[PDB]
Symmetry: D2
Subunit: 115 residues, 4 copies
Amino acid sequence: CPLMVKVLDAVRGSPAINVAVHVFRKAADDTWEPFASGKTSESGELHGLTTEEEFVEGIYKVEIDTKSYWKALGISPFHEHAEVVFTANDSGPRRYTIAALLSPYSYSTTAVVTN
Amino acid sequence: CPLMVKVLDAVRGSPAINVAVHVFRKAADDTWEPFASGKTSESGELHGLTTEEEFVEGIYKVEIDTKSYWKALGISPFHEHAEVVFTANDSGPRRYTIAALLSPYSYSTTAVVTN
Amino acid sequence: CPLMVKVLDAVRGSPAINVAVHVFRKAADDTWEPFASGKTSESGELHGLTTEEEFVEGIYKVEIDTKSYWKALGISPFHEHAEVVFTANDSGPRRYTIAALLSPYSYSTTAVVTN
Amino acid sequence: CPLMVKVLDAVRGSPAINVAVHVFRKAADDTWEPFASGKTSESGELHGLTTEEEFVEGIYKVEIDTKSYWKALGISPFHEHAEVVFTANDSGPRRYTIAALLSPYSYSTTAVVTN
Ligand SMILES: [Ca+2]
Ligand SMILES: [Ca+2]
Ligand SMILES: [Ca+2]
Ligand SMILES: [Ca+2]
Ligand SMILES: [Ca+2]
Ligand SMILES: [Ca+2]
């Protein structure tokens, strides 16, 4: 995987399972083209979004449907979603892990970029 | 302030000063309309973005220009920006503090909502 | 204040009110001596712990009783407490804000140090 | 592994490698008994600290030498270390992952507790 998404639940201390994730690529006309999507697994991970052939340089947006996740647990969330926007591969393909730690009124996101 | 933004630098343990912040409100046609903008002060806070009359119900997006902040410090950060999207004032007028804590490859954002 | 502690609740998006906080300073014999204590106010802040005369160089430990906080809300949290340990005033007198952001299975802590 | 530690670097966007980690168990006389230790691998993970035979109920402290890690990178850290203190297995053995996300003036820690 050149791009992996991992989501954690800070209220329950568990992976965040069945979280919808959409990935977009910035088109030339500055709009967001859908690129890939899925739902986090039981380990809160989403693999196989793209291939390194397809994952070329550009600006990508990862949208995490945090609101539906909290709605499903019966907990009021603040955010509509969590967005992560970044420029990829600007020094060559590496592997990207986008981690997100979710609370109802707070989230953090971290990129782990390795060889 | 019905809406205040506060940004901290986790590398230096300081307010993040002169960070540009753009606020948008989602219109009837589902486009983002520019709502307010400003920059954080020496305390890392941005006050006076709006008024309670102007700050009606809606979906708002606060876009914090973290990239320019890190670049001006010689750092090439992961994220293009930190975006915070939320429904405001749905159950009546509230006061919102949007906090952001910045690291070059990570950020967190927290909402404090008071009545 | 040379030393202020501020605690937020990430589940409710509010200050964390009435949170007990104990401060210790490491003595010559490497034991922790009680230094100051208090509880967070309605704003989630604890002021007036010490004075600049009393707040000499040393290693300090701020222990935030997060467990009692969550328990009183019916939540069984992961952590016994959040402990923050740091050398203070090594290059001269500074003002320290120790922020903590609390979730039942996660917390973050940030220092803001100003001169 | 009934207990695993994972450390990430929020400045470099990478696992935090060669971070010293000590695990303690609270003795009957309220002092901390060393229990296990190691250094994070190239993936920022530390496995094989204990066995489920040995990892009985009790209060455990995980001390992460964040200060040496930042010193090794030539970056001034605020904290002496990061401590995580928690009661284990209080409803039966599960698997514990203690994750820590490190910045020079800020850290977060999260417990991922699974079956
Ligand atoms: Ca993968
Ligand atoms: Ca204000
Ligand atoms: Ca309404
Ligand atoms: Ca004060
Ligand atoms: Ca000194
Ligand atoms: Ca393991």
